[PDB]
Each structure stands twice: as structure tokens, then as C-alpha cells.
Symmetry: C3
Subunit: 221 residues, 3 copies
Amino acid sequence: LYSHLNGTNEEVLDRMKVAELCKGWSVYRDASEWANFKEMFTPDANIWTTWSGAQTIDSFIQISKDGKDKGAFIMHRECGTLVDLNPKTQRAIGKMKTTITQRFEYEGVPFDIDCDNYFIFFCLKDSNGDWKARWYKVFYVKDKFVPVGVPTAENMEKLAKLFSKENLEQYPWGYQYLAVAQANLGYPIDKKLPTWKNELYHTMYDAMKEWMEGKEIDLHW
Amino acid sequence: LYSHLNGTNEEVLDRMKVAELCKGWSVYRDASEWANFKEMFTPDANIWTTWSGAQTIDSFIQISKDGKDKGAFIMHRECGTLVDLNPKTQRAIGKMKTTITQRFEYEGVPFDIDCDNYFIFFCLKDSNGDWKARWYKVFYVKDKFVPVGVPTAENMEKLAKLFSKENLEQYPWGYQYLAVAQANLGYPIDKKLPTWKNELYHTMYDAMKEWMEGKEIDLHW
Amino acid sequence: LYSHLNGTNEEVLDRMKVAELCKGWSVYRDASEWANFKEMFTPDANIWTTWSGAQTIDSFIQISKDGKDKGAFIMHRECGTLVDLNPKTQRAIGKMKTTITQRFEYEGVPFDIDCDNYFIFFCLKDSNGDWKARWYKVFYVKDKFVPVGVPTAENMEKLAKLFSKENLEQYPWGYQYLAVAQANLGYPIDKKLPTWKNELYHTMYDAMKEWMEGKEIDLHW
Ligand SMILES: O=[N+]([O-])c1ccc(O)c(O)c1
Ligand SMILES: O=[N+]([O-])c1ccc(O)c(O)c1
Ligand SMILES: O=[N+]([O-])c1ccc(O)c(O)c1
Ligand SMILES: [Co+2]
Ligand SMILES: [Co+2]
Ligand SMILES: [Co+2]
Ligand SMILES: [K+]
């Protein structure tokens, strides 16, 4: 019995504010607006990504800065955002569909990997009446290899060596291409993230329900 | 003389609520949140899609469930949503740009078809003061074949047999690739949907004007 | 010390109205809703694009109409929009991530170029209390060639002649593919637009700061 469509004017405005917060990932992180990014989160927020695994908000900002300085090139396309709001507990879940789009190079050939997903922001209204995210985790739905230059036969033969069936199969279906490409860059890959095929899908939805009820959770699996 | 930018605070809030409703297609349908999806619609709403043709909201939910259980894999990326509002008649048109992105397989090779379009939601404010969509139909703008794995020469030769010029030309320009791929799955294809090239473009815009004036319409062509 | 998340109800509503304004580019321009498009702008607004260079809002509308009549086919996918608001000066910056997606043909082979970017709208609240954009310019981040039909070896060999390394290198990294394709259509290309690699990145952020302080600017570089 959450608020998510229509509702009172105050409910609408709360859902607008939570929706903006989520979109800050796409707008602020891609642009390295790190103070604006940090404002989305509680001081003790925890984040998970494929390439970082579990992090605090502050540790995630530091390691992201480090990666960008080394040439990591990740962008997000926001693809539809709505909010489930519980006005009684001052809790909300922001559901922000995105494509993660990361630019890579192998043997001189540029390419993207594009991964469609849901970013899930576990939000609360704090002592100042401000919405903030305490937890962030992602459901990874599907991904693909994306040519950047004209995909001539010779360049695609080289890239096919990296995206072998054996390499893709090491990772959960939903982020296999992204994981292969990030691991080739040297990142550790968190293989215990939710998809739309594995069992962590259900652990995620259970944590979302408990959050909305006002309970404490812990996504450290 | 619709309300669509600026306006009074109540107009802004109405346009926010209608915009959220439209986005429910991308957020709720992709995630099989069927109760949240149904809440977007009047009880007697009618829907059209390429693969379903004309449906009621309830029949569409049932056949979508059936297709997902059989492995149909359709997602949406929301690409820009605004609202035309007539406060005098309590009517609105939600205009939600999207990409329909459906995952397919042919002779063991995965691929997507991505179709850019406008989703048009014909909305009214009901007896409870809630916005709901009574009619939904789409303008199909352009589409493309999307490789998923590295597009090596041999895999693309097999797929080229399915996307022959003769097969594409059976369908309205704007959704030809999507129609070929869905028909190969066994779906009937509705060939009488609006594009940006055919004459139904104008029938659509006429129905939108009459809806905003408070009149009854019927999209059953 | 801008307003961009949370804030007062009036601040939220101002940011909602500015966000809608920006999205009008994607919704209205693609659909040739030219009166709705013009409403986004002050009467004396100035616009820059890769294919038009500097224009007034009225001159841009005329030349866009001309190009569409000749078959130019540009669409936008909106990819995340937020607003920086200064309530003291009645000034705002709308930051709208997009993909510019333009459909082309070379030697009988269709293709898209997709360019990820930030659209920046320099907005003010006018005498009627309405938000309007006085300046519009873009940060071009990355781009790619996009096959439309199945990318068989023979069709990609022809297209590779157009997207030679020497041709791409004529343009700023961030919009090189888009520039090559638009120049092949006969458009002049503005090579002095901001990217995430060139020095105009900093001139842009400086103009945004001065705008928010209530000062006059001039993007005519
Ligand atoms: O913000 N990013 O860079 C992200 C977020 C989630 C991911 O799984 C990822 O690979 C990158
Ligand atoms: O919701 N979907 O699955 C849709 C909606 C419209 C379409 O034309 C379609 O092919 C699929
Ligand atoms: O509106 N458009 O057509 C645009 C806007 C910016 C661009 O740089 C462009 O190439 C096209
Ligand atoms: Co701030
Ligand atoms: Co509900
Ligand atoms: Co108007
Ligand atoms: K979007």
C-alpha cells in the first residue's frame, strides 16, 4: 500500500524529490560533480557496483576519482524513474532504470559495453526533512557488445577473442559482457549481484519490502 | 491552448502525476509489477502494440504474462516525457518517447531490435481526482537491428537471411525490423499502427485533439 | 550554494518546471511541434548545434524546418535531467543528458550516428514568472557509428571509406562520427563546441557560474 501514482500534493512532491536524487547518479557522477553526488546519500551510505563491490559512499567517491584519473570512462543513460513511498515510515524506494555504458579499447579497437539495469535507491527522510539514500544496489538485466567504429571483419575477429563463450560464462547472465570488459581492464568483479535470472533477485525484493516497513536491513551478502 | 510548460502550481502537479503514470510502462511492465501497471489505467482501458494488436488492459496483462512465461523479453528505455493538459476538461495527453528493446535469437545468435517511438497516453482525471489512461497507442518512428555478441562475419550472414529486404518491406517503415523479429517468434503483427510516414499519423493527432476537448474517441481502426 | 535536491516546495516546483522545459527539446523538436518548442525560449534566445553553429531561436526553427523538408532525420533520447537553481537571482541551469541519434545513408546503406552529450539550458524567470531559456549549448562527450541493417562484411567495407581515421580526426573528439556524417550530408560543422577533452569545457563551466550569479554572458566564441 505504497504511494507511487497520484496521491496527495505532499506525496507527489516527496516522489519528485526522490526521483531527482536517483537521477543525480547519471547527471553528477558522469560529470564528476562529486559534492552534488555526495548530497544524494546519508553520511554512512553503502554502494555496490560490478567493478567496486561493496563500498561506503566516501570510499566509492575516492576510488571513482582514481579510476577516472586513470582513464576509466563510464556513463549512464537514465531510462525511466519512479518511486515507491511510505509516508507513515518516511521511507522510499527509488527505481531508476538505466543503461551503464562504458567505453573500452582492445588491441587498438574501441568499443562500448551497454548494460540495461535497475538502480535501486533505499531512501529515508532525515532529521532535516531531506530525502537521502542509505543503500544503493543494482538489478542487472541484460547487456551487449557495442561497436564504436564501423564493424569491419578484421577488427571484429580480434575482439571476438576477448568475448569468448568461456569468458562470458564466468559471470552472471545480465552483466557478462560488462564483467569481461571490466576484468580485462584489471577490475575485480563482484559476482554476487542481483540479476533477473539468479536467486539474489528475491533477496533484493525482500530487503526492499523490509526497508519500506521502517526496518533495518543489510545488503552485505 | 493547453498547459504544458510553466502554469499554475496545480497544473504543474497534474503534469507531474501524468508524467509518472506514463513512465509506469517502462518501470512496471519490464519488472512484471502488474498491480502497479494496472493502476495506470481505467478499468476499461484499451491498448495497442505491434505484437498484440488491440487489447483491453486486462487481456493485455494476461497475454503479456503468458508471453513472459514463454520467454518473451521486451524492455523499454524512456527517452523524454511531457504532458499536454487541459484543466477545463480534466483531460491530458502524455507523450513518452521510448526505445522498445526486445531480445531475440536466430540460429543460435542473440540480437536485439531497438525501435524508437512515442507512447501516447490518453488520460483523464477520474471520480477520485486520480489521473488514469483510457487509451494507449504508439507512433513508431524508426528501428534497427542491434548485435549482442561481437558481430563476426559468419554470424551476421545467418541473420541476414531473416532480415531480407522482402521481409522488411512487408511492414510499415518505422517498425519493420521489430515486426520481422516478432513475426519470426510467431506473433501476429498489427500493420495498421501510426508511424511518422504513413497516413495514420494524422488520424492519431486528430484523436488527440478531440480527446483534449473532452470528447469521446475510438482508436479501433 | 544552489538548490538542486530537496529544498522548499517552491524550489521543487521551479526545478520541475525547468526540467520540463529542457525535455521539450527531445519531445517537441523531434515531433516538429514548433510552437511548443519556441515556448521553451526567450524571444532573443541563442542556440548552437554542430550542424547549424550559432543561431537565434527563430533562425534555428526556420533552418530546422528546411532541413526536415529535405530529409534530415535527427532524434534525441533524453538520458537524465536535473536543475541547478538560484532562487535569489531567479536563474537556473538545466542539465539534460541526451543521445543525439541521426539517421543517414551512404552508398545505399542506412546507419545512425549516436552522440552522448549534456544539453545545457541557461534559464531565467521572466516578467510573467515563467521559466525560459536564453542560451543553449552542448557538451559533446562521446559518439559512435551505429549499424541499422545486419552488419555484413560487404556493407561495412563501403561505410569504412567514409569514417576513415583522417576524416574523424578533423573534428573534436566527442562528436567526430556525427561531424563526419553531417559534413557528408553537406552541413557546415562548428568545430568550436565544448567537449569533455578540449579547453572549451572550462569556458562553459565559467559561463554557467556567471549566469547563476545573475550576470550577463555571451557564448558567441
Ligand atoms: O557508477 N558506475 O560506474 C557503475 C554503477 C554500477 C555498476 O555495476 C557499474 O559497473 C558501474
Ligand atoms: O509493451 N510492450 O511490450 C510493447 C509496446 C508496444 C509495442 O509496439 C511493442 O512491440 C511492445
Ligand atoms: O537538435 N538537434 O538537431 C541537434 C542539437 C545539437 C547538435 O549538436 C546537433 O547535431 C543536433
Ligand atoms: Co547542494
Ligand atoms: Co498502488
Ligand atoms: Co503553450
Ligand atoms: K529518460
